[PDB]
Design a protein around this ligand. Structure first.
Ligand SMILES: Cc1cc(CCCOc2c(C)cc(-c3coc(C)n3)cc2C)on1
Ligand SMILES: Cc1cc(CCCOc2c(C)cc(-c3coc(C)n3)cc2C)on1
Ligand SMILES: Cc1cc(CCCOc2c(C)cc(-c3coc(C)n3)cc2C)on1
Ligand SMILES: *C(=O)CCCCCCCCCCCCC
Ligand SMILES: *C(=O)CCCCCCCCCCCCC
Ligand SMILES: *C(=O)CCCCCCCCCCCCC
Ligand SMILES: *C(=O)CCCCCCCCCCCCC
Ligand SMILES: *C(=O)CCCCCCCCCCCCC
Ligand SMILES: [Zn+2]
Lengths: 29, 238, 252, 285, 285, 238, 29, 285, 60, 29, 29, 29
């Protein structure tokens, strides 16, 4: 589960499991 | 396999960690979200709403709505003191107000406070009062002249029942401790008679005043902590 | 000439025809607080020339047995005209300083003073457990403190000049902004120091930011000892600004 | 840009507070300080309106004050005890009707809202006390029994087979068990408060007990009887993730007495029951 | 180039010292060796100015002398003891008012600066001494209590629920616990020294105690009473990360006596109180 | 899952490791950084500043400012020795100087040292002195002639009160141990009367001299270690 | 949290947690 | 190509030995077999020069014979013993003056060179012997004390604070500790041999003791006194990484007797002191 | 976190393993390398040099 | 610390720590 | 065993072992 | 040691150690 961004400053927002409940704290706004 | 180096901290459980974990109920699909009015996204939203200050919380008044009112009346001596409290957001009597309660869930605070007062006398009752904020580094003012030298608002009671006094953030440090700390005590707010409570004949000779408090656009809390304004001295049973 | 100096501040002008340059503490010239670093939100009052001028403190006598002297800022100026009034009428204050120490003798005199400006000179007490220096003792005002004269009291600070009155060795004081008044070379010392603190503004009544320490490292000697050789200090606030106006704070 | 947003996350500067602008003296027939609280609105007066302010650049952020942050901290919600005293078969297993009402600390925070929707992270901290000296090899089984599933009545009950229910097995020495649970309600949000009944008679139940049934947590020491007796205490910690809250309310002012109810007790001297410290008089700060 | 910079990091060659250039004989009316220390400046004379030097290529680096390196080493700052002697309920928990003043080694290094700003890395090393033979299953709880939060007065105090405070649970056998803490001050930097008071009276406190309150660390053995008594000593190590320091000062020359104060004690023979070894005379090396 | 191989070293705690760890206070936003004069980024900055050498630290002088001065006076014998010390950065009396103290936090040193001397006699007092550095491999010089054969500066006292002698890095190895080690002893610095201390009548017949030390552009310390110039013999209490 | 450089000698300056305090020792200068 | 080079690494075919070429009968006035050893050079004659060889393709590699390979194997260099007999405070800590001279196996290999430069990998293997039955919770502290740093004289010495020194804490049950050390010398290479003294008098020291001071390793059982006594033996293993060696020399032919010296002892029957087995005569194979 | 499978061999110490490990002395900069004659890179270099055979090694 | 080669047969010579001493055995020649 | 998708939201459906039985739960439909 | 194929179904045949003996079972044919 990988949200790869690029700027280089690359971001990897990995989701290791297949259920949304499994992810960590939510982003803000 | 890939060589790894287990780092210190591994296996520990930190109540404030932010990790992922497997879901006990795979394939489960949560109930559809519907629109519900009143969503709150940040506690600051609650800190910007006025709530009453139990300013008259003397032992005899506690447990009565009267602990929320200040009584005014015709004076025989000029420039008399009406009330005086500390500006410290989590000190008493500010502690149990919504902003005080929320501030008690944090360690640091900053920003300006908004104190409002609503006169509840008759429409024919007049009055001019001086509300003052005394920055720290000095004792609470002993007289109106002393208080008047600091930040203040002269409130003239009339058609509009409410007035607001803003306690500006005047501090050496960018933040102050929410808990009573000598170094970070924020000062005092005192109220004095500017002129006098005046009424025509056949009109009640006393009247009440309500006091509110909320945070300004710059109010901000920091470092979450458990509150000391509520306790559990035993099991909570069914 | 590089030996001459003229310093004008407000309505005061000071001169010296035998200087040893000047020191700008940490290489930063005093300046007003910027909106990026500010925290207090009320508009500051800036007295300008009526506050930023030279104030001359009480002179001291230097003799063969002198151990040293120290003053604390802003305490030393608490009773100096408009600057003094402002620090008591306001909760917050901020200021830089131009310190000019004066001491002339003759070409047949010898002696050396070490003039140092110390930030946060937190004094120690000796052999008194965890009892710390009393407020009264660290706030001597313009009279400052003559090391080795005060009859000890429990809250009396250390008078050990060789241990900097705080548990560190005298020889290392040179790490702080300083100058020497070596009678054979100069008759004055000039130090310009900026505001130094972990907060943008502070209470000038309970926090002394700088401490002026003068220690004679080379004993005053001559063949005309009857002639008194004084040491005079003139301090000028710079970019003084205050905030949080109210009634006047009365101490004690 | 998700990368700029990312940097804001790392620095915790997603929600910035406004600056204070310089103001000046005024003489006007527009009086911002005057208003009418009767309207039910808060006067939005700011410092620039009542005094002469300077310009100040704010660097404070409200990230930590977010609902996600406020409720996103793991707190204890239950302490399960398995004390082997004199009968292993009876004392080696137990059950708990799940709820977030038994521990005041987290209960009070959630109850500052009327409705809340969130996913849960449960972390368990088991500690085995060696009452007789040795602990042997302790293996625990925590089984989630949804309302309706058969609840085990013995340590060897067939229900422990966990053919469908979710069970977590922990082995002493291994790291603390932890798992996530999706929003479980049959409604769109959990009721923190519920002014309703499960019927319309004098004997109908009142409050959240009617709506908040989350099932039962059944625990058992999997290991068979050992020579040395042990006392296993398992503390359950709960954290809210991906949170949403609605309709804020006043914080609990008195101690809690029971679960699923706002009931409270008052002494003859009520000032002792609330956090309000009596004042000497109106002018004593 | 971040990759070239990277290589410099690996080789530790980010800050290189200058080379020594070849010099020659001189006969001039410009005398670099002569100056005036009265100015308060250090004469910047170099070897090439006083002797005839050869050309030498320097390969030394100042990386290790950086403030980050100097203060970036984990040192002990506290040794917490939980000794179960005769009362488990009273002896199984404790508290400590946090500070970096109790251990001379790291205290002296930080105090070589007036102000310092840094993030902290705390690593804990717990050791369980089996006083009676067995240790059973030890699980520890370290809770950070910010100033103002309720401090637990018993091992089962509700405050241990940690509904909001940050708690770290460690299980014996698992690796040493470790976490990071952001710069905690309400000011822009920590005061290493503070020539101020918390008031203007004879009884006002003096020094850093006025400004450096970091709260309390409360520890407790989570495991319930066991047959065999143990003595758990938890050593707290602290390391500064992302450091900045201002206004260097002389190093502490005498032993420390108390926290938050520069106070010291002197014997009748002061040469024994300082590291200066008495010389026989001026010419005896 | 991904197959891994746990490597030796895993789970250990090395006080000098450089790892990442979860933050106990998530979402917390640190106080804004303000400009503070005097930022230090490298200890070398402190090693380049002159500090006084307690050169006259005889038992009777310790605890007195006089331990920092050397007395000069008219001589009756020519070429007399004034003082002599070891050049070793962490040896006594160099140990307690700022550079000596910092060097004591490291194991190796290299570079050239700068020794300065300020004459404190009257403006009418004259003097010529010879300051010499004797490289290792020989004992300290017994006479001015012996010292003079090494690196040296002839200081003429005049309008400019201060002189500087540079002790060049003359070593077999690129570094030397900071702690006293026979193999890495750096040599001596001696001071002799070149001419004589001369004064007119009615002028003090003795004068003081101050001695400073700092590091040159090539000074460098290596391998951090705990200092032996400070100890803790008991608990530090509140 | 990945700062990917290229030179091939690729650099991966990964930040595993979401708070700046969590990262290791700082770079120099 | 770094990938082709990579394949050579995996197959260990970086350094290939030459092939043998086919040769033929010869009748010449050029006699390769004849030379003069007096020159100090080895006659470079090859098999093709003395016999009629066939063509053979060589597949042997010299990778394993590289200096990196020869010295790149971890061997024991010290066995530290902490035997608790009757006084915990005195017997729970120790110190060792570091050196690679105490164990013959690795010492002999390094001494086949005059100078060597390398980084070190240290791996420690602690084993706790339960003398009385239980071992409790053993936590060890290994502190590297560079020459000059204060050496602890008691198990609670302030030096153990490790405010600057590098300490490694190991917890029983966790994997073997391991760390790397950069080339430590003040010179450009380590001296394996040193024909010099630290002075020019009859009492000056001779040999590598003058140049090879690496400091002291101080160990201590962090855990406080326990009921049951233990004997902790920590074996230190050392491996050379990124190695360079200069001027090869003859291998040690007799047993070592002391550290930092080539000294040896001879018996009355010297053939017993060397590995040379006496021959019956010149023609007995 | 990333699911992992700890493989047999983990935690063992093999004297001939080739792994990386943290450096006890961070920021430390080694002494500059100078040219020294006689560098040896492979033991084969020593095997190609003639040495004397103690061929007449009878006990006497 | 990643030396990424390509040939596809990609090589990843990763250096996990920031000090050269930390890396494994050296290459040959 | 990596099924790399891109959308950027990159998906990495990794199969760590070489036997199909080894993979996790199947997708649906 | 990474043999990266692409088809997207990317294959990563990683060799974690530097000796051929270290790799797993051989492919077939
Ligand atoms: C409101 C509100 C929301 C909730 C849910 C609390 C979560 O409770 C559970 C706990 C503590 C453990 C498990 C569980 C599941 O699987 C296992 C081994 N334990 C399941 C639930 C629902 O309860 N009240
Ligand atoms: C100056 C100065 C700076 C500081 C901060 C020191 C850090 O102290 C803490 C320690 C040792 C542990 C915790 C802690 C937090 O969470 C847990 C379990 N322990 C928190 C702090 C602030 O103290 N003085
Ligand atoms: C030649 C030559 C080269 C060397 C260096 C040997 C390495 O010795 C050390 C050992 C065995 C352990 C440590 C050490 C460092 O940190 C810790 C916990 N242990 C440090 C050194 C220098 O010694 N002789
Ligand atoms: C998301 O849906 C799948 C999560 C996959 C977890 C493994 C993450 C590690 C990927 C490493 C691949 C390296 C690329 C060549
Ligand atoms: C940064 O903000 C997120 C850090 C993510 C940690 C996981 C790093 C491993 C990534 C492997 C992906 C392989 C690419 C195909
Ligand atoms: C080198 O200087 C840094 C070493 C970084 C160690 C992490 C290696 C794993 C990288 C996985 C990234 C996957 C790419 C998307
Ligand atoms: C599939 O057939 C092979 C599975 C390989 C497992 C390792 C996955 C991690 C890959 C990381 C590579 C990073 C890319 C540069
Ligand atoms: C092969 O020769 C080297 C093997 C390297 C093992 C590490 C594999 C993990 C690579 C992750 C890199 C992620 C890419 C950005
Ligand atoms: Zn047993």
């Amino acid at each position: 589960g990988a949200q790869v961004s690029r700027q280089s400053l690359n971001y990897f927002n990995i989701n290791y499991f297949k259920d949304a409940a499994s992810s960590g704290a939510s982003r803000l706004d | 396999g890939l060589p790894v180096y287990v780092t210190p901290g591994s296996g520990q459980f930190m109540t404030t960690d932010d990790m992922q974990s497997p879901c006990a109920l795979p394939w489960y699909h949560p109930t559809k979200e519907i629109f519900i009015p009143g969503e709150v996204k940040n506690l600051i939203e609650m800190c910007q709403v006025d709530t009453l200050i139990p300013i008259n919380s003397t032992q005899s008044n506690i447990g009565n709505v009267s602990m929320y009112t200040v009584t005014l009346s015709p004076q025989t001596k000029l420039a008399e003191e009406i009330f005086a409290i500390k500006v410290d957001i989590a000190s008493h009597p500010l502690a149990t107000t919504l902003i005080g309660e929320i501030a008690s869930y944090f360690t640091h605070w900053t920003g300006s406070l908004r104190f409002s007062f609503m006169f509840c006398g008759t429409a024919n009752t007049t009055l001019k009062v001086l509300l003052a904020y005394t920055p720290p580094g000095i004792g609470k003012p002993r007289s109106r002249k002393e208080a008047m030298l600091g930040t203040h608002v002269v409130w003239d009671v009339g058609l509009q029942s409410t007035v607001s006094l803003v306690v500006p953030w005047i501090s050496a440090s960018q933040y102050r401790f929410t808990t009573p700390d000598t170094y970070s005590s924020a000062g005092y707010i005192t109220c004095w008679y500017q002129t006098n409570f005046v009424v025509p004949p056949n009109t009640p000779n006393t009247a009440e005043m309500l006091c509110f408090v909320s945070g300004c656009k710059d109010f901000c809390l920091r470092m979450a902590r458990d509150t000391d304004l509520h306790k559990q001295t035993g099991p909570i049973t069914q | 000439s590089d030996r001459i100096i003229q310093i004008t501040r407000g309505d005061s002008t000071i001169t010296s025809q035998d200087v040893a340059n000047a020191v700008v503490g940490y290489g930063v010239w005093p300046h007003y607080l910027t909106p990026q670093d500010a925290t207090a939100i009320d508009k500051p009052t800036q007295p300008d020339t009526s506050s930023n001028r030279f104030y001359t403190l009480d002179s001291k006598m230097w003799n063969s047995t002198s151990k040293g002297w120290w003053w604390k800022l802003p305490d030393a100026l608490k009773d100096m005209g408009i600057f003094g009034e402002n620090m008591f009428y306001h909760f917050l204050g901020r200021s830089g300083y131009t310190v000019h120490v004066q001491c002339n003798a003759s070409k047949f005199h010898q002696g050396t003073l070490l003039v140092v400006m110390i930030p946060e000179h937190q004094l120690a007490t000796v052999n008194k457990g965890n009892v710390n220096a009393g407020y009264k003792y660290t706030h001597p005002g313009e009279a400052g403190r003559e090391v080795g004269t005060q009859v000890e009291n429990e809250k009396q600070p250390s008078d050990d000049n060789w241990l900097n009155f705080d548990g560190t060795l005298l020889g290392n004081l040179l790490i702080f902004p300083h100058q020497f008044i070596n009678l054979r070379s100069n008759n004055s010392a000039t130090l310009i120091v900026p505001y130094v603190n972990a907060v943008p503004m502070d209470s000038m009544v309970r926090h002394n930011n700088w401490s002026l320490v003068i220690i004679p490292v080379c004993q005053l000697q001559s063949n005309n000892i009857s002639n008194i050789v004084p040491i005079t200090v003139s301090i000028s606030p710079m970019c003084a600004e205050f905030s949080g106006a109210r009634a006047k704070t009365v101490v004690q | 840009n998700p990368v700029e947003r990312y940097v804001d996350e790392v620095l915790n500067e997603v929600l910035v507070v406004p600056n204070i602008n310089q103001s000046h003296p005024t003489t006007s027939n527009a009086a911002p300080v005057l208003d009418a609280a009767e309207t039910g609105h808060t006067n939005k007066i700011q410092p620039e309106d009542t005094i002469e302010t300077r310009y100040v650049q704010s660097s404070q952020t409200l990230d930590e004050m977010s609902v996600e942050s406020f409720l996103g901290r793991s707190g204890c919600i239950h302490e399960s005890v398995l004390d082997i005293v004199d009968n292993y078969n009876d004392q080696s297993f137990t059950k708990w009707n799940i709820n977030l009402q038994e521990m005041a600390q987290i209960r009070r925070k959630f109850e500052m809202f009327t409705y809340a929707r969130f996913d849960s992270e449960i972390t368990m901290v088991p500690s085995v006390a060696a009452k007789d000296g040795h602990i042997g090899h302790i293996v625990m089984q925590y089984m989630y029994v949804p309302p309706g599933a058969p609840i085990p009545t013995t340590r060897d009950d067939y229900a422990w087979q966990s053919g469908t229910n979710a069970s977590v097995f922990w082995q002493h020495g291994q790291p603390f068990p932890r798992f996530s649970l999706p929003f479980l309600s049959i409604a769109s949000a959990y009721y923190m408060f519920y002014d309703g009944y499960d019927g319309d008679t004098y004997k109908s139940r009142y409050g959240t007990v009617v709506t908040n049934d989350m099932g039962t947590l059944c625990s058992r020491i999997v290991t068979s009887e050992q020579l040395h007796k042990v006392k296993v205490v398992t503390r359950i910690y709960h954290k809210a993730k991906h949170t949403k809250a609605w309709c804020p309310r006043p914080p609990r002012a008195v101690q809690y007495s029971h679960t699923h109810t706002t009931n409270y007790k008052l002494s003859s001297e009520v000032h002792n029951d609330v956090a309000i410290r009596p004042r000497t008089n109106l002018t004593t700060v």
